[PDB]
Amino acid sequence: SIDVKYIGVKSAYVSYDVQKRTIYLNITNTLNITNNNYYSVEVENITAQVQFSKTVIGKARLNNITIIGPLDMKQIDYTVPTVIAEEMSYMYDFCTLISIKVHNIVLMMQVTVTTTYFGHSEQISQERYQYVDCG
Amino acid sequence: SIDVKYIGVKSAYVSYDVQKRTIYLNITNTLNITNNNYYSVEVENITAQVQFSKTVIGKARLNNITIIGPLDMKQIDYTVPTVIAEEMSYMYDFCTLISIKVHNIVLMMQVTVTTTYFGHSEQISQERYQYVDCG
Amino acid sequence: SIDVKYIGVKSAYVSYDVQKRTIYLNITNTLNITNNNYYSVEVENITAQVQFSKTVIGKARLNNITIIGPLDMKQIDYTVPTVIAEEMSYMYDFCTLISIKVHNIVLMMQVTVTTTYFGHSEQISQERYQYVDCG
Amino acid sequence: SIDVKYIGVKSAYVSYDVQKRTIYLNITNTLNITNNNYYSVEVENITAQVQFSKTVIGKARLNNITIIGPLDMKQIDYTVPTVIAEEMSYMYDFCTLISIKVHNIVLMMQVTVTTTYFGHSEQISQERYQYVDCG
Ligand SMILES: *[C@@H]1O[C@H](CO)[C@@H](O)[C@H](O)[C@H]1NC(C)=O
Ligand SMILES: *[C@@H]1O[C@H](CO)[C@@H](O)[C@H](O)[C@H]1NC(C)=O
Ligand SMILES: *[C@@H]1O[C@H](CO)[C@@H](O)[C@H](O)[C@H]1NC(C)=O
Ligand SMILES: *[C@@H]1O[C@H](CO)[C@@H](O)[C@H](O)[C@H]1NC(C)=O
Ligand SMILES: *[C@@H]1O[C@H](CO)[C@@H](O)[C@H](O)[C@H]1NC(C)=O
Ligand SMILES: *[C@@H]1O[C@H](CO)[C@@H](O)[C@H](O)[C@H]1NC(C)=O
Ligand SMILES: *[C@@H]1O[C@H](CO)[C@@H](O)[C@H](O)[C@H]1NC(C)=O
Ligand SMILES: *[C@@H]1O[C@H](CO)[C@@H](O)[C@H](O)[C@H]1NC(C)=O
Ligand SMILES: *[C@@H]1O[C@H](CO)[C@@H](O)[C@H](O)[C@H]1NC(C)=O
Ligand SMILES: *[C@@H]1O[C@H](CO)[C@@H](O)[C@H](O)[C@H]1NC(C)=O
Ligand SMILES: *[C@@H]1O[C@H](CO)[C@@H](O)[C@H](O)[C@H]1NC(C)=O
Ligand SMILES: *[C@@H]1O[C@H](CO)[C@@H](O)[C@H](O)[C@H]1NC(C)=O
Numbered sequence: 001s002i003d004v005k006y007i008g009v010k011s012a013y014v015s016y017d018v019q020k021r022t023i024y025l026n027i028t029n030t031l032n033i034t035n036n037n038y039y040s041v042e043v044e045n046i047t048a049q050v051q052f053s054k055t056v057i058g059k060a061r062l063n064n065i066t067i068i069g070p071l072d073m074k075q076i077d078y079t080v081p082t083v084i085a086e087e088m089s090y091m092y093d094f095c096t097l098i099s100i101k102v103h104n105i106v107l108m109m110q111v112t113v114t115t116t117y118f119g120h121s122e123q124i125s126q127e128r129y130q131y132v133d134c135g
Numbered sequence: 136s137i138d139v140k141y142i143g144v145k146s147a148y149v150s151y152d153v154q155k156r157t158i159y160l161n162i163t164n165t166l167n168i169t170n171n172n173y174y175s176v177e178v179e180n181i182t183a184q185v186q187f188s189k190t191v192i193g194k195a196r197l198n199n200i201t202i203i204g205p206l207d208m209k210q211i212d213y214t215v216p217t218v219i220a221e222e223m224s225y226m227y228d229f230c231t232l233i234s235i236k237v238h239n240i241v242l243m244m245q246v247t248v249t250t251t252y253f254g255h256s257e258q259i260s261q262e263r264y265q266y267v268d269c270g
Numbered sequence: 271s272i273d274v275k276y277i278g279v280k281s282a283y284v285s286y287d288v289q290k291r292t293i294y295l296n297i298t299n300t301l302n303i304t305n306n307n308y309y310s311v312e313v314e315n316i317t318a319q320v321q322f323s324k325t326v327i328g329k330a331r332l333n334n335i336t337i338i339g340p341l342d343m344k345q346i347d348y349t350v351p352t353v354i355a356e357e358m359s360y361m362y363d364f365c366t367l368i369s370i371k372v373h374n375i376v377l378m379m380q381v382t383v384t385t386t387y388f389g390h391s392e393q394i395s396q397e398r399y400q401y402v403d404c405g
Numbered sequence: 406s407i408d409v410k411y412i413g414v415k416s417a418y419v420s421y422d423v424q425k426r427t428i429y430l431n432i433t434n435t436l437n438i439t440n441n442n443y444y445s446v447e448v449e450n451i452t453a454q455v456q457f458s459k460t461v462i463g464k465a466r467l468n469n470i471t472i473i474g475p476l477d478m479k480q481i482d483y484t485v486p487t488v489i490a491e492e493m494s495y496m497y498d499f500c501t502l503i504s505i506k507v508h509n510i511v512l513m514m515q516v517t518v519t520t521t522y523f524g525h526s527e528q529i530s531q532e533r534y535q536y537v538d539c540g
């Protein structure tokens with residue numbers, strides 16, 4: 001890829017920003033831009049293109065064949081008991097979190113048993129992430 | 136991809152922003168822009184293009200064949216009991232969270248047993264994420 | 271890739287930013303830009319292109335064959351009990367977190383048993399990450 | 406890759422930034438830029454290109470064959486009990502964290518049993534990371 005940018009606050013080509021408590025007086029700003037961009041991206045120039053997938057089974061004897069794809073989960077267990085017993089007591093809870101299997105982003109591409117792929121694949125993630133804020 | 140940008144606050148090409156408590160006086164701003172963009176993206180220039188998938192089964196004997204695709208979940212268990220017993224007691228709870236299997240984004244593409252793919256695939260995620268804010 | 275940038279606060283080509291408590295007086299700014307960009311990225315110039323995958327099974331005898339793809343999870347167990355017993359007691363909790371299996375980003379590409387791939391693959395992640403902030 | 410940059414605060418080509426408590430007076434700034442960039446990246450110039458994968462099974466006898474892909478997890482156990490007993494006692498907790506299996510970023514590419522790959526692969530990660538901040 002081209003021009004993949006994370007900018008926290010502010011982006012510009014030409015900036016004349018003026019901040020608090022300023023005396024901006026008697027200024028002459030002269031700007032003469034010639035900014036040209038020419039892109040040629042993922043361009044195929046092919047006379048003859050042949051792409052294929054072939055699966056042939058002849059005079060075979062197949063018996064007792066097991067295929068299991070990825071991400072197989074079996075006999076998983078989560079046990080998070082919470083017991084609170086109080087007797088003539090004081091208790092104060094502020095900003096208490098019990099998190100089990102919390103997900104923000106899941107991107108899945110070409111998760112298979114068999115794949116044949118011709119071409120371009122991309123995954124882009126940009127974020128600002130903040131889980132707990134309790135001030 | 137081209138020009139994938141995360142900007143937290145502010146974006147511009149030319150900015151003359153003026154902030155609080157300012158004296159902007161007697162200013163001459165002269166701007167002369169020539170900004171041209173020429174894009175040629177994912178362009179195929181092919182005389183002959185042949186693409187195919189072929190699956191042939193001849194004089195075969197298949198018996199007792201099991202195929203299982205991905206993301207198989209079996210015998211999963213979540214146990215999150217909460218017991219609160221009070222006797223002549225005080226209790227204050229503020230901003231209490233029990234989260235089990237919480238998801239924000241799930242993007243799935245080409246999740247299969249068998250795939251044949253010709254071309255372009257993309258996934259883009261941009262976000263600002265904040266789970267808990269209790270001040 | 272080209273031009274993959276993480277900028278924490280501010281980006282520019284030409285900046286004349288002025289900050290707090292300033293006397294900007296009697297300034298002459300003259301700017302003459304010729305900024306051109308020519309990109310030729312992922313460009314195929316091929317007369318003849320032949321790409322294929324072939325799987326042939328002849329006069330074979332297959333028996334008792336097991337294939338298991340990746341990321342297989344079996345007999346996993348999480349046990350996080352919390353017991354609080356109080357008797358004529360004081361207790362104050364602020365900003366308490368129990369986290370089990372917390373995920374922010376999961377990107378999966380070509381997670382398979384068998385793969386044949388022709389071309390370009392990319393994964394880009396940009397972030398600002400902050401788990402706990404309790405001041 | 407080309408031009409992969411991590412910039413903590415500020416980026417520019419030409420900067421005339423002025424900070425707090427300044428007297429910027431009687432300044433003449435003259436800038437004459439000729440900045441051109443020519444890129445030719447991942448460019449194939451091939452007369453004849455032949456790429457393929459072939460798997461042939463003839464007159465073979467296969468029996469009792471087990472293949473297991475990577476990242477196999479079996480009989481994993483986590484035990485994190487927390488017991489608090491109080492009797493005529495004072496207890497104050499601030500900014501307490503129990504973390505089990507916490508993940509920020511997971512990028513997976515070509516995690517398979519068998520792979521044949523022709524071309525370009527890339528993974529880029531840029532971040533600012535902060536786990537706990539409790540002042
Ligand atoms: C600004 O420039 C003009 C022209 O040179 C001049 O007459 C004027 O007095 C100046 N002002 C200040 C505040 O110096
Ligand atoms: C600005 O740019 C153009 C193109 O290069 C040039 O011909 C023109 O004379 C320039 N003008 C000034 C004021 O410098
Ligand atoms: C593309 O292919 C043709 C045939 O070989 C060639 O004559 C032509 O100049 C090429 N053009 C580009 C832009 O590469
Ligand atoms: C601003 O510029 C004009 C023209 O040069 C001048 O007459 C005027 O007095 C200036 N004002 C200040 C506040 O200096
Ligand atoms: C601005 O740009 C054009 C194109 O380059 C140029 O011909 C023109 O003279 C410029 N004008 C000024 C005031 O510089
Ligand atoms: C595309 O293909 C034709 C045939 O080879 C060629 O003559 C032509 O110049 C090409 N054009 C471009 C824009 O690549
Ligand atoms: C700024 O420049 C002008 C022109 O040279 C001059 O007349 C003016 O008095 C200057 N102002 C200050 C504050 O020196
Ligand atoms: C600015 O750039 C153009 C292109 O190089 C040049 O022809 C022009 O004379 C320049 N103008 C000035 C004021 O220097
Ligand atoms: C591409 O291929 C053709 C055929 O060999 C050649 O004549 C042409 O000059 C090439 N063009 C480029 C841009 O590489
Ligand atoms: C700045 O420059 C001008 C021109 O040389 C001059 O007349 C003016 O008095 C100067 N101002 C100061 C503050 O020295
Ligand atoms: C700036 O750059 C151009 C291109 O090299 C040159 O022809 C022009 O004379 C320059 N202008 C000045 C003021 O130096
Ligand atoms: C690419 O290949 C052709 C054929 O050999 C050659 O004539 C041409 O000059 C090449 N062009 C480039 C840009 O390498």
